[PDB]
Amino acid sequence: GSHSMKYFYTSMSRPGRGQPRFIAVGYVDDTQFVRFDSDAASQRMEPRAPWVEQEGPEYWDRETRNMKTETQNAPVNLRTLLRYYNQSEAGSHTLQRMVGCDLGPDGRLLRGYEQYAYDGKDYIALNEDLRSWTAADVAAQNTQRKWEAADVAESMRAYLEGQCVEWLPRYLEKGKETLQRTDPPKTHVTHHPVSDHEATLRCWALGFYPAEITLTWQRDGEDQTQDTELVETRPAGDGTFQKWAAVVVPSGEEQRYTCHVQHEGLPKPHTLKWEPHH
């Protein structure tokens, strides 16, 4: 189908705790493959997925030099942002970056990303055209006009349409046996009384990959998205994911409800209902 490669950098200044801290994590869809921490012992990009380790030392030194470079700039951008927003030193701040690309089933670039965020809020972002930018607020403009003056978008665009698109497939190739596979959710419904008048039906979905999934509670074939409680999809810790939808129901009317699970590993969606009797 269509995949995506994404990197997530986090730069944090920590006044009186030492120089800023830089952390980087990378993912191929819902799988992290590399990691870096300017605090860790190493000081090198590290593999966090088996299928990566088979790259050559040449590959890792390159990445590590990069992460070291990022570590270096960190305290600079953080200082700049401090200037741009007219803030003092005392405070503790965060500069976030997210660069990546999405490829369609064919393998052509569906769209790349290059965006930052200061202290949680949007800072600047390469527009979908990969040529113009968008500045969150007045300060952010500083970076905008500065990047335009320097055709920064150009280089980013060259990466997104080049390196990013060319690499994402090599990772998918080597990762074949796991990245390019879909494990359907193992589902089942449970009944939990809440009173003499209402029971909680809970629709389970576990051990599935990728993370995208849809659970819907239907009553007589009617979507019950309002009375449905959805827990935010979470990590099983072994690669697969979990999730469950719950809806409260009047005792007896159990059979009135049906659960719908949709995943890309299920040609035909799963549809289940609670079972107690006999």
């Binding site: 470079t69 990022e70 741009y84 800072y123 500083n142 990047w147 320097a150 390196q163 990013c164 690499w167």
Partner: peptide, 8 residues
């Protein structure tokens, strides 16, 4: 592979 970083 990681891209190159520009400075704000």
């Amino acid at each position: 592979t990681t891209p190159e970083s520009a400075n704000l």
